[PDB]
Amino acid sequence: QEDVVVTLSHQGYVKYQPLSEYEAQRRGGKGKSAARIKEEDFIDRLLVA
DNA sequence: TTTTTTTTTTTTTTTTTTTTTTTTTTTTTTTTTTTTTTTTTTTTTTTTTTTTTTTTTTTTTTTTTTTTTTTTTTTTTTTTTTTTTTTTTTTTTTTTTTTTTTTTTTTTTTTTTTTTTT
């Protein structure tokens, strides 16, 4: 269907795409949700919603 | 009755070609090795009320160096042409359906003879 989905591409080999509803609201001041996106000595570049 | 001409398949063995046994190179295939996903629990991390002293924005004014500015001549932009690649009509070939025409092979069992090896 059309459902809001996240996508991100990193340096090297990443085109991972999780669903948007897994992450919940937070108050600005805490952050650090620690998403689970394994990366071996590369750098993230892009996120899209 | 003797004697003379010609014709071919064999003594043929050698040249040419064909057939049949061979083994280098790019395309398969089984193994080990490294990327993925789901649970336990676990100290550990992390979400949310209360108080607090803070440190940056908004009253007001100042200037100067980036915002005004006009103009010459470049040079990226656009035009035409042609080549290279992509992609889709067109054609060809092959396979399956069900009644017809044709064929071809592998082994037991015993007993006797050829046909090679020692």
From Swiss-Prot:
What is the superkingdom listed in this entry's lineage?
Bacteria
Motif GyrA-box mapped to chain:
25-31
List locations, semicolon-separated: Cytoplasm
* Description of its domains: An N-terminal fragment (residues 1-523) can be reconstituted with GyrB, but the complex no longer has negative supercoiling or ATP-independent DNA relaxation activities, although it is capable of DNA cleavage; ATP-dependent relaxation is inhibited by novobiocin and non-hydrolyzable ATP analogs. The fragment has ATP-dependent DNA relaxation and 30-fold improved decatenation activities, unlike holoenzyme it preferentially binds supercoiled DNA. The C-terminal domain (CTD, approximately residues 535-841) contains 6 tandemly repeated subdomains known as blades, each of which is composed of a 4-stranded antiparallel beta-sheet. The blades form a circular-shaped beta-pinwheel fold arranged in a spiral around a screw axis, to which DNA probably binds, inducing strong positive superhelicity (about 0.8 links/protein).
Other facts: When the enzyme transiently cleaves DNA a phosphotyrosine bond is formed between GyrA and DNA. In the presence of quinolones this intermediate can be trapped and is used as an indicator of drug toxicity. The enzyme-DNA intermediate is also the target of a number of topoisomerase poisons, including toxin CcdB. Few gyrases are as efficient as E.coli at forming negative supercoils. Not all organisms have 2 type II topoisomerases; in organisms with a single type II topoisomerase this enzyme also has to decatenate newly replicated chromosomes.
Q: How would you summarize the oligomeric state and partners of this protein?
A: Heterotetramer, composed of two GyrA and two GyrB chains. In the heterotetramer, GyrA contains the active site tyrosine that forms a transient covalent intermediate with the DNA, while GyrB binds cofactors and catalyzes ATP hydrolysis. Can form a 2:2 complex with toxin CcdB in which GyrA is inactive; rejuvenation of GyrA(2)CcdB(2) is effected by CcdA.
Q: Which family does it belong to?
A: Belongs to the type II topoisomerase GyrA/ParC subunit family.
Functionally, this protein is described as follows: A type II topoisomerase that negatively supercoils closed circular double-stranded (ds) DNA in an ATP-dependent manner to maintain chromosomes in an underwound state. This makes better substrates for topoisomerase IV (ParC and ParE) which is the main enzyme that unlinks newly replicated chromosomes in E.coli. Gyrase catalyzes the interconversion of other topological isomers of dsDNA rings, including catenanes. Relaxes negatively supercoiled DNA in an ATP-independent manner. Negative supercoiling favors strand separation, and DNA replication, transcription, recombination and repair, all of which involve strand separation. Type II topoisomerases break and join 2 DNA strands simultaneously in an ATP-dependent manner.
Q: What is this protein called?
A: DNA gyrase subunit A
From which organism does this entry originate? Escherichia coli (strain K12)
Gene name of this polypeptide: gyrA
